[PDB]
Design a protein around this ligand. Structure first.
Ligand SMILES: CCCCCCCCCCCCCCCCCC(=O)OC[C@H](COP(=O)(O)OCCN)OC(=O)CCCCCCCCCCCCCCCCC
Ligand SMILES: CCCCCCCCCCCCCCCCCC(=O)OC[C@H](COP(=O)(O)OCCN)OC(=O)CCCCCCCCCCCCCCCCC
Ligand SMILES: CCCCCCCCCCCCCCCCCC(=O)OC[C@H](COP(=O)(O)OCCN)OC(=O)CCCCCCCCCCCCCCCCC
Ligand SMILES: NC(=O)C1=CN([C@@H]2O[C@H](COP(=O)(O)OP(=O)(O)OC[C@H]3O[C@@H](n4cnc5c(N)ncnc54)[C@H](OP(=O)(O)O)[C@@H]3O)[C@@H](O)[C@H]2O)C=CC1
Ligand code: SF4
Ligand code: SF4
Ligand SMILES: [Zn+2]
Lengths: 425, 185, 77, 353, 134, 122, 118
């Protein structure tokens, strides 16, 4: 009989406090005396004006000398109301909003929204689209790890690998511009497949880059992996146990670094990841050094997947073949009545999506990215909620940093793959 | 943590090894420590790069590569006769994810369906190509041009005059880019 | 007159030759901005050095979406 | 006070009152808007959605004015006061023109008469050629063409020229204004030593620059302010010494004035102005100006006529000078016995670190 | 980064005057075959033995060189968007009497900067008052 | 408390007696903090003027007779109090709370019918 | 705000507006924002209405004529135009004029036509 039952406050609702069980005491392991003197902490604001590791980050820390007492990240400096805007857009019009969430991982961001909409559309995309999206997925994973690992290396003082690897970014950004017409915000992966087919000379150009990328990974490992300064900066820093990582909502490398073998591409396969072979790097100490080694090995497995996609690329259409969902080819639209109508309706009204809801998750470069979409049967989504892995990771910053040195905070900010378009949305 | 079923073979790590049991000689261990062998190896890598060709190009005398699909400055196009391609369908105004296009239209003096206002707010536009994809006559296109930074924000409020002039200037690129990519569109 | 133009040329040559931006890298535009310091374009070849604090900087590059929550910080720097 | 304003020449202005995007309907030119006071009139007009024409000399100096208005509202024009084409290109579209052009010192290029008398005369002649509705001419307190002081004198003739060419000229006589970026409160609060040949005994009624800017806006709205004259001053008379007392009382620093005598300081003030290239706050006609004492005309409209009540400068020293009071831990007054006792509840060194 | 043998060779192929002039704008010692000239007077060169993306380059006609001075179709060529230079490009030969005759550079920061305006009439027209006589 | 400086765990009130104590407790903390609020945001008003605003905010909700609604208002008050006493708010946020500092005034609605009509709906 | 011909002419090839809601350039480029400006530098594309009417009539004997703009996939959607009325038929996309040969003598009789006829 809520909420009038609350008008006069009967039957308080049970909290988690009302279910605290006393531990079993048998097996439970857990004057002007100067010991009673209190210690005053000083509270320091870090960011966003004063330089931080990266992004729009106001990090408010309570310190005891050099040690972190409380860590309090203030976010929303990049909260742009993306989730509300999506309710005033068609599904086509909302797709570019996903490029701008994790804005170094554009195609996998648009991949997760395409898969969720495809699920409510009840359509199976063509095999060539599946292989193109998987291929661009691992190209985007390398682009992300190049940004993440190297800028994390640059934050702790290692200038040079960032320069070397961003030329690799330039080469892979050319592939993004060749398929779409953009360096970053491709809007390439759409529900139904991909916008347009790849130009006839792209696969060989990707292959030529693939023959030399292993050396680029190796030269990066020459400066960091065995370097004793790098090890002393990362080993034993930002430790989280396997049990707490699950309870903190950690996904991806932040979870696999603590020993849990789990990859969304393996557990719930999507696109063509069931048709490709790859290994999952897993750490054992749950620290920044293990997470660095997992990400370096993910470079090699991504390249290994890309080579398989180059050889397994099938022929056929790249867009689902129903002009009620995907736009017809321009020659069809100018030729026959049916195609022109379907072109007109898809670009003014949009396609109608059957009502319902779904939670769809992928293994994004920064961990489990998910999207929760509610369809009301119309051409605009009723609700779009985005699950960003960086949001859960930064929410754990206090748990992993309390009691530790202020001089290790830059290491764990970089060990979390943190882009604040993901965090704030 | 592990999947249901029996533990994966050899998932449990063997017990830690004591200092005594390390399979590495003292002289090698002491030598690497005092001589900093892995740091010397990393320095040697830099000298190898010091004698490799740099990747730098000398912009604006040289330019980076762009594709026929590249999405830059907007333009309004004509037919070979010079008639406007635009017929005020409003498909680009409806699909626009950022509401950057504003259009008004009536019958022209000759009775043709044409626009009277065609504005693009370049400070609202997200450069996604949706208008160019939605246009049934190839009227709105994105040119390859990207070098049009302006002194004032008002210079980025393009009206129909600015857009038709852009199409007149850039038409040979616009036709070449359409020529190369139209088979894939 | 000619003297004052000469100092004008000299003082302007120094402002162009050492162009030090304070990159307020708010979002994805900062990624393209970050690619100007990389080997392909190498802004350092022209004298551009990115600076972390506004005190050492001559130019502010606002590269990103400015939210209301963030605007007071931008005005402060 | 309404959605309709009818201008002197009859134009009806149907106005949508609001903020940045609204329709104020007025087109205004503000000469000398790049100075201390020009920011408060330009800001007030632009944020009502009025079009403000800003003639400028230095580009980097006027950059802050654009923020006031919506797109297309603040318009900049390159101008020289001896380029007539530039003055009347800046004015031919306006229905109100503010003349805020003044200078307390002579320069190599402009005598006080060149910038004030000849300056006004070119602007006022442009106003009459295009039939601008309201020409508000800003002047000085003590403006009198019979004064020995060239400042007051050249502000006197320019009043007479403006009223002759354009009889409906509105003359505004502000007293020395304080406020943000003023030359009263911060000048006292900042310079280590002042060369004042009168022991800071000149008296006047300081008025907030904000209220002068607001007053200028209020004359635009009422057609009854045309052909009028406005002395604009604060409630209470002060002297440079008494205001310096307030300044010192707020920044915890002691003022020190050398006070060289007039026959020696005045020629030196001339030399410094002819060899240094900036406003030194010191010049021959400025030393003479400090012996004069602001005398308020009794036959001139005041803030009363505009519905305003000026605030006293002592209400504003703390606000405007707060960022100049030291806040180092070294400077707090001694700890109370309450403070001495609580310190013994804390450890004051980390021995483990 | 030229290297000694590259710079020494290009010096011999170009001479010291040209070498120093090239050092005054591009800051390198480049030599190649003249591909063509655009309407503004920019000269375009090709050399396929250069480093990738450095095989095409422009010598600007104007001392205050700006990237917007490049003729449209040449802009595609130098950015590797096409391989056929405008000298052999048939789409540059279609006669458009409306096409701008002189080159259009970026006009920002000058008095030729584009001024936007409403291109339509007011949506509402007030009555024109006509006081009927008594 | 434990999470951050002025953090109050969200709890329902048991009864109207419980709610009244919290409301008076919330008011007491607010008007006590008024001297600190002035010097912490350099507010150009006296503590008297600030403390009046506190009472009016509590008086807009004096007539609430629903327990669940009170719990909502109490949670809002704690959230506003924490973000004020922690220097999380900026001077722009606190200054916007004082309705006098808007350039169109504080009497932002017409006094009566004829003043609003003559100006054009206010 | 405009004396020169670029500031008055609606287009280089047409003085007058070609739609009723079109703002005349003389009023559009007037006001304070156009004071210190070069007017020849402003974008002034040619009027499309004047150019299409220089196109000669494409004569045909067939009653129905297809038009797609002539670029194949690079033109407009293919439509079919009826030439049975004794007048010049115009494509509703590209404005191209079409006429049947049956009406040539009456169209040649007409004092002035919308299209050159030759
Ligand atoms: C500071 C400057 C650097 C000083 C160190 C550089 C010289 C290192 C000399 C080599 C150290 C060990 C020498 C040795 O005899 O090692 C044998 C013994 C264990 O034998 P082990 O190698 O482990 O058996 C094979 C298992 N795989 O290991 C041991 O029992 C330790 C014996 C140490 C004896 C060291 C004698 C040499 C001291 C050199 C001083 C140099 C002074 C000039 C600088
Ligand atoms: C010019 C000619 C060439 C010059 C070569 C310069 C080489 C680069 C110098 C860069 C600066 C030196 C970097 C040193 C890095 C460092 O400090 O590492 C700290 C490391 C920690 O070791 P430690 O604390 O003792 O405990 C080890 C158990 N995990 O402690 C160590 O690793 C100490 C081992 C290095 C000792 C070197 C000094 C002895 C030199 C020979 C005797
Ligand atoms: C290299 C050598 C370049 C020499 C260039 C000489 C340019 C200085 C010309 C000085 C001049 O003609 O003006 C006199 C000037 C007084 O400055 P003024 O603008 O009249 O006063 C403003 C506020 N007092 O006095 C000066 O400012 C002179 C400053 C020292 C020179
Ligand atoms: N401030 C005060 O206490 C008092 C001021 N007044 C009068 O109030 C008005 C505004 O005062 P305030 O804003 O404080 O003065 P400022 O000195 O701050 O600004 C004066 C303005 O005049 C312009 N100007 C000066 N000389 C010339 C010139 N030769 N040609 C063109 N422009 C010129 C300046 O432009 P630029 O920045 O380019 O130099 C500047 O914008 C002036 O008329 C002044 O005389 C009178 C009594 C008291
Ligand atoms: S540009 Fe194309 S899509 Fe937009 S109104 Fe013109 S014809 Fe229609
Ligand atoms: S590019 Fe995208 S955002 Fe810009 S006008 Fe075209 S549809 Fe709108
Ligand atoms: Zn046609």
């Amino acid at each position: 009989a809520e909420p009038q039952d609350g008008f006069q406050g009967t039957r308080l609702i049970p909290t988690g406090a009302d279910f605290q069980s006393p531990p079993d005491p048998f097996i439970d392991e857990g004057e002007d005396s100067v010991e009673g003197r209190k210690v005053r902490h000083y509270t320091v604001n870090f960011g966003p004006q004063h330089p931080a590791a990266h992004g729009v980050l106001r990090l408010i820390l309570e310190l005891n000398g050099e040690e972190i007492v409380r860590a309090d990240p203030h976010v929303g400096l990049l909260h742009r109301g993306t989730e509300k805007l999506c309710e005033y857009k068609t599904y086509m019009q909302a797709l570019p909003y996903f490029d701008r969430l994790d804005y170094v991982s554009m195609m996998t961001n648009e991949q997760v929204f395409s898969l969720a909409v495809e699920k409510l559309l009840n359509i199976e995309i063509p095999p060539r689209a599946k292989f193109i999206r998987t291929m661009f997925g691992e190209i985007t994973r390398i682009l992300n790890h190049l940004m993440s690992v190297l800028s994390h290396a640059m934050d702790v003082g290692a200038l040079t690998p960032f320069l070397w690897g961003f030329e690799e970014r330039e080469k892979l950004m050319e592939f993004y511009e060749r398929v779409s017409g953009a360096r970053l915000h491709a809007a390439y992966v759409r529900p139904g497949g991909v916008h347009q087919d790849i130009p006839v000379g792209l696969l060989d150009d990707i292959y030529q880059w693939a023959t030399q990328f292993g050396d680029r990974i190796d030269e990066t490992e020459e400066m960091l992996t065995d370097n004793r300064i790098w090890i002393n900066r990362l080993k034993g820093v930002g430790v989280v146990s396997a049990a707490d990582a699950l309870n903190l909502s950690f996904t991806g490398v932040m979870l696999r670094g603590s020993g849990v073998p789990w990859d969304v591409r393996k557990s719930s396969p999507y696109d063509a990841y069931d048709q490709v072979e790859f290994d999952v790097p897993v750490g054992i100490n749950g620290d920044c050094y293990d997470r660095y080694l997992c990400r370096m090995e993910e470079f090699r497995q991504s390249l290994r997947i890309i080579h398989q996609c180059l050889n397994k690329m099938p022929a056929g259409p790249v867009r689902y073949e129903d002009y009620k969902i995907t736009p017809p080819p321009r020659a069809a639209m100018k030729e026959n009545m049916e195609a022109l109508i379907h072109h007109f309706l898809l670009f003014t009204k949009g396609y109608a999506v059957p009502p319902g809801d779904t939670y769809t998750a992928i293994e994004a470069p920064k961990g489990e990215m998910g999207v929760y979409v509610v369809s009301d049967g119309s051409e605009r989504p009723y609700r779009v909620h985005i699950r960003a892995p960086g949001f859960a990771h930064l929410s754990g910053f206090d748990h992993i940093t309390r009691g530790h040195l202020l001089a290790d905070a830059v290491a764990v900010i970089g060990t979390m793959d943190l882009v604040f378009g993901e965090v704030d949305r | 943590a592990t999947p249901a079923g029996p533990p994966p073979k050899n998932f449990r790590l063997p017990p830690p090894k004591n200092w005594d049991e390390e399979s590495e000689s003292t002289i090698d261990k002491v030598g690497k420590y005092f001589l900093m062998t892995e740091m010397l190896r990393g320095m040697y890598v830099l000298l190898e790069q010091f004698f490799r060709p740099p990747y730098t190009i000398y912009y604006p005398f040289e330019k980076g590569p762009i594709s026929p699909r590249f999405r830059g400055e907007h333009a309004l196009r004509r037919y070979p006769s010079g008639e406007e391609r635009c017929i005020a369908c409003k498909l680009c105004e409806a699909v626009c994810p950022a509401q950057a296009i504003t259009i008004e239209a009536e019958e022209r003096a000759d009775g043709s369906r044409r626009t009277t206002r065609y504005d693009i707010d370049m400070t609202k536009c997200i450069y996604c190509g949706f208008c160019q994809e939605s246009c049934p006559v190839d009227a709105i296109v994105e040119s390859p041009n990207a070098e049009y930074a302006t002194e004032t924000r008002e210079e980025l409020l393009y009206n129909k005059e600015k857009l038709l002039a852009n199409g007149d200037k850039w038409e040979p690129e616009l036709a070449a880019a359409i020529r190369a990519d139209a088979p894939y569109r | 007159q000619y003297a004052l133009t000469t100092l004008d040329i000299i003082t302007n040559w120094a402002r162009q030759g050492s162009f030090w931006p304070m990159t307020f890298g708010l979002a994805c535009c900062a990624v393209e901005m970050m690619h100007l310091s990389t080997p392909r374009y190498d802004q350092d070849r022209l004298g551009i050095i990115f600076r972390a604090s506004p005190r050492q900087s001559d130019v502010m590059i606002v590269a990103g979406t400015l939210t209301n929550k963030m605007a007071p910080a931008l005005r402060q720097v | 006070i309404s959605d309709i304003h009818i201008t002197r020449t009859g134009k009806p202005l149907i106005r949508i009152q609001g903020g940045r995007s609204s329709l104020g309907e007025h087109t205004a030119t503000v000469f000398g808007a790049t100075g201390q006071l020009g920011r408060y009139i330009v800001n007030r007009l632009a944020r009502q959605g009025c079009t403000v024409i800003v003639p400028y000399r230095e580009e980097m100096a006027k950059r802050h004015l654009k923020v006031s208005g919506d797109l297309g509202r603040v318009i900049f024009m390159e101008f020289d006061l001896r380029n007539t084409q530039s003055i009347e290109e800046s004015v031919r579209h306006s229905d109100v023109v503010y003349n805020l052009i003044g200078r307390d010192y002579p320069t190599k290029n402009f005598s006080l008469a060149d910038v004030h008398i000849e300056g006004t005369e070119r602007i006022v002649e442009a106003v009459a050629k295009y039939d601008v509705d309201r020409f508000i001419q800003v002047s000085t307190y003590n403006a009198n063409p019979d004064s020995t002081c060239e400042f007051f004198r050249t502000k006197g003739i320019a009043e007479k020229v403006a009223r002759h060419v354009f009889p409906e000229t509105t003359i505004v006589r502000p007293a020395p204004m304080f406020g943000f970026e003023d030359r009263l409160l911060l000048k006292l609060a900042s310079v280590t030593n002042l060369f004042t040949s009168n022991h800071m005994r000149e008296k006047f009624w300081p008025v907030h620059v904000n209220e002068v800017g607001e007053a200028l806006e209020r004359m635009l709205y009422d057609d009854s302010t045309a052909g009028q004259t406005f002395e604009l001053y604060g409630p209470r008379q002060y002297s440079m010494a008494q205001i310096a007392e307030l300044v010192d009382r707020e920044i915890y620093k002691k003022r020190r004035h050398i006070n060289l005598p007039k026959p020696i300081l005045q020629p030196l003030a001339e030399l410094i102005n002819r060899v240094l290239w900036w406003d030194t706050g010191l010049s021959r006609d400025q030393v003479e100006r400090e012996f004069h004492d602001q005398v308020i005309d009794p036959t001139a409209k005041t803030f009363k006529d505009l519905g305003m009540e000026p605030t006293d400068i002592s209400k504003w020293t703390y606000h405007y000078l707060l960022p100049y009071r030291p806040s180092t831990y070294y400077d707090l007054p001694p700890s109370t016995e309450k403070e001495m006792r609580e310190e013994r509840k804390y450890l004051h060194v980390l021995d483990d670190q | 980064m030229s290297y000694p043998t590259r710079t020494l060779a290009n010096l011999r192929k170009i001479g010291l005057k040209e070498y120093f002039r090239q050092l005054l704008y591009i800051g390198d010692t480049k030599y190649g075959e003249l591909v063509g000239v655009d309407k503004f007077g920019n000269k375009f060169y090709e050399n396929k033995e250069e480093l990738p993306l450095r095989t095409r380059w422009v010598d600007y006609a104007k001392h205050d060189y700006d990237a917007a001075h490049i003729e449209p179709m040449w802009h595609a060529w130098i950015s590797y968007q096409v391989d056929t230079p405008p000298t052999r490009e048939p789409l540059t030969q279609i006669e458009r009497p409306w096409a701008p005759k002189e080159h259009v550079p970026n006009r920002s920061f000058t008095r030729g900067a584009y001024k936007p305006y409403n291109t339509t009439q007011p949506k509402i027209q007030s009555w024109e008052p006509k006081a009927a006589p008594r | 408390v434990q999470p951050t400086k002025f953090a109050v765990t969200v709890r329902q009130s048991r009864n109207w007696a419980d709610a009244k104590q919290r409301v008076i407790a919330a008011y007491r903390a607010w008007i006590r903090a008024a001297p600190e609020i002035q010097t912490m945001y350099s507010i150009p008003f006296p503590v008297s003027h600030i403390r009046t605003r506190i009472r009016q905010e509590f008086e807009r909700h004096r007539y609430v007779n629903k327990l669940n609604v009170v719990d909502v208002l109490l949670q809002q008050s704690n959230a506003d109090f924490q973000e004020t006493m922690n220097f999380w708010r900026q001077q722009s946020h606190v200054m916007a709370f004082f309705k006098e500092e808007h350039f169109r005034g504080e009497k932002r609605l017409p006094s009566n019918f004829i003043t609003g009509f003559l100006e054009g709906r206010n | 705000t405009g004396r020169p011909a670029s500031a008055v002419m609606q287009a280089p090839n047409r003085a007058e507006v070609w739609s009723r809601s079109q703002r005349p350039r003389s009023e559009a480029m007037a006001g304070p924002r156009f004071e210190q400006t070069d007017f020849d530098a402003q974008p002034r594309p040619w009027a499309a209405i004047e150019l299409i009417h220089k196109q000669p009539v494409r004569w045909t004997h067939d009653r129905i004529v297809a038009c797609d703009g002539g670029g194949g996939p690079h033109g407009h959607p293919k439509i079919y135009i009826n030439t049975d009325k004794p007048e010049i038929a115009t494509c509703n996309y590209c404005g191209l004029p079409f006429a049947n040969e049956h009406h040539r003598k009456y169209l040649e009789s007409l004092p002035q036509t919308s299209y050159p006829l030759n």
